[PDB]
Design a protein around this ligand. Structure first.
Ligand code: VO4
Length: 574
């Protein structure tokens, strides 16, 4: 197969001289490649899970050889339960090779062709080319690994054993299974996307030009309720969204949300769209919608975290500093585990409520003075492709990206508190970064005139180039905020999918109705003023629960960090 020419990453080449960062990078490369060829572990929740598994293996492999002081390994060597028992180094003392072994074994197990039975049903959809393309990435990473790879070393072999334990423990082969699920139409109810109601997929993936068959995808409807959690110590729930169950009476919030959805997330040339050019940029910047050569949101969050890590590293030598290695190893384990669990819980709630997307809500509203039967959103950008392909659909509430961001950035905050500065766990931090470029707006990627050619580099393919925008952020609190609201600008999520409207919008004298500027564009509170404290009720449970994905993510990250990254007790696993 012809190797896919991957575009250059906007990041200092010095980063990959550190082996921890190098392996994180390989995981990121596999993420973007798998979404380009349609391989395994695609979609938001599962792509996050792969990174969580990769980093847990690296974490325990490294720390087994170089024991930490203020914490321990995820699994222990003395665990009576064999499934949770970590292997012994027994002489192995080369952390570099141990990490290499863990990373390579995990990634290979995750992306290899499931010949061992799983080929049927599960893998029966992924082409052999998809597997070959992924194999290529793994093959060249071995050649690029700083310090080389020695598969004959006891240390490498030890890393491999660590990976085997984690893979056997946390891999969910049936992850995105939709077998048996069917939408339950009605008001507020999720259903097939009116702009992409069906997909024509080949009967034989290895014969893409042969007969096709209509298919209706539903992205992982059972994953959230049945999959094994990583480090969360309890179940997390959200308040009922406006219009459903206990909050069925919040019609003022719902109606105003529809109003805002139309003005802020409609297609650019619609007379009803009030979103500014700058807000459109903010919307695209955080997208990462499983596009060709781009991948999913977890990949971008990792790109951002890489810069933060290097920017605030304790020692200057990226290559030979054990302090830096331990630092990066611990940080990424925490960040990616939180990302994995955020994906589990956002998906659980998504499919629990089955709340419809703004597109369907506005079109099927039914009230002449509220809806727009012909409304169109700016939508999630279909980057490096000539059309808007069918992307696996899933409910709106809560926003997956909002949740991912909440967990990832709150984790970064908890981890760097006292070091970069000092702040309350629920107040803005000072973790600033600059020269942060999104692959959605990097002056290289584009919207093609013809179908993507996997044999040619992106710059040689005709299309409209995405403007290059270099950003600077004042804090992780800001990153978290913008990442969440960008979804409103895209028109893919309701305001409450991100967080409680009262916590992010400017209120008026009318309850549940928020302010807009001269142009009719919604006004947001200053990032420094934002506090996610507004809560709501649940019909099935007593108490007050958070509203939206950001609060959920923060809640998840705080719990994992407070417990010091400990395995979810098996007694509470599904
Ligand atoms: O990925 V959302 O679920 O944030 O569109």
């Amino acid at each position: 197969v012809t190797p896919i020419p991957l575009p250059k990453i906007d990041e200092p080449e010095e980063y990959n001289t550190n082996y921890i960062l190098f392996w994180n990078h390989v995981g990121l490369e596999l993420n973007r490649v798998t979404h380009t060829v349609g391989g395994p572990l695609t979609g938001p929740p599962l792509s996050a899970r792969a990174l969580g598994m990769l980093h847990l293996a690296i974490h325990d492999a490294y720390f087994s050889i170089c024991p930490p002081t203020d914490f321990t390994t995820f699994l222990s060597p003395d665990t009576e339960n064999a499934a949770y028992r970590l292997p012994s180094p027994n002489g192995a003392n080369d952390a570099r090779q141990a990490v290499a072994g863990a990373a390579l074994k995990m990634l290979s197990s995750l992306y290899m062709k499931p010949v061992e039975q799983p080929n049927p049903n599960p893998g029966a959809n992924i082409s052999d080319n998809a597997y070959a393309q992924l194999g290529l990435v793994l093959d060249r990473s071995v050649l690029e690994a700083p310090g080389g790879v020695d598969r004959e070393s006891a240390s490498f072999m030890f890393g491999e054993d660590v990976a085997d334990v984690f893979f056997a423990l946390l891999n969910d082969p049936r992850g995105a299974s939709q077998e048996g699920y069917h939408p339950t139409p009605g008001r507020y109810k999720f259903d097939d996307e009116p702009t992409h109601p069906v997909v024509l997929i080949p009967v034989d993936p290895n014969n893409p030009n042969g007969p096709k068959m209509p298919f209706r995808q539903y992205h992982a409807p059972f994953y959230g309720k049945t999959t094994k959690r990583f480090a969360t110590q309890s179940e997390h729930f959200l308040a009922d969204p406006p219009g459903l169950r206990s909050n069925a009476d919040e019609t003022a919030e719902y109606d105003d949300a529809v109003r805002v959805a139309i003005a802020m997330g409609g297609a650019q040339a619609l007379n009803s769209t009030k979103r500014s050019p700058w807000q459109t940029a903010q919307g695209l910047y955080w997208a990462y919608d499983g596009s060709n050569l781009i991948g999913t949101p977890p990949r971008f969050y990792n790109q951002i975290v890489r810069r933060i890590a290097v920017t605030y590293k304790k020692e200057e030598d990226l290559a030979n500093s054990e302090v830096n290695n331990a630092d990066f190893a611990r940080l990424f384990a925490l960040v990616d585990v939180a990302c994995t669990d955020a994906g589990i819980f956002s998906w659980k709630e998504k499919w629990e409520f089955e709340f419809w997307r703004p597109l369907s809500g506005v079109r099927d509203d039914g009230r002449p003075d509220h809806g727009d039967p012909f409304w169109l959103t700016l939508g999630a950008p279909a980057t490096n492709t000539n059309d808007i392909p069918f992307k696996p659909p899933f409910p709106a509430y809560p926003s997956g990206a909002a949740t991912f961001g909440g967990a990832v950035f709150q984790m970064v905050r908890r981890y760097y508190n006292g070091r970069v500065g000092t702040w309350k766990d629920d107040e803005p931090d000072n973790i600033a970064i600059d020269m942060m470029i999104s692959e959605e707006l990097n002056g290289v990627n584009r919207d093609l005139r013809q179908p993507y050619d996997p044999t040619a580099p992106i710059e040689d393919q005709p299309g409209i180039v995405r403007t290059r925008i270099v950003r600077h952020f004042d804090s992780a609190w800001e990153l978290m905020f913008e990442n969440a609201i960008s979804r409103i600008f895209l028109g893919v999520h309701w305001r409450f999918d991100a967080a409680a409207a009262r916590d992010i919008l400017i209120p008026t004298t009318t309850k549940d109705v928020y302010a807009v500027d001269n142009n009719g564009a919604t006004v947001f509170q200053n990032v420094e003023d934002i506090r996610y404290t507004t809560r709501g009720t649940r019909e099935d449970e007593e108490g007050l629960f958070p509203i939206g994905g950001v609060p959920l993510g923060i809640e998840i990250a705080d719990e994992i960090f407070n417990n010091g990254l400990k395995p979810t007790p098996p007694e509470i696993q599904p």
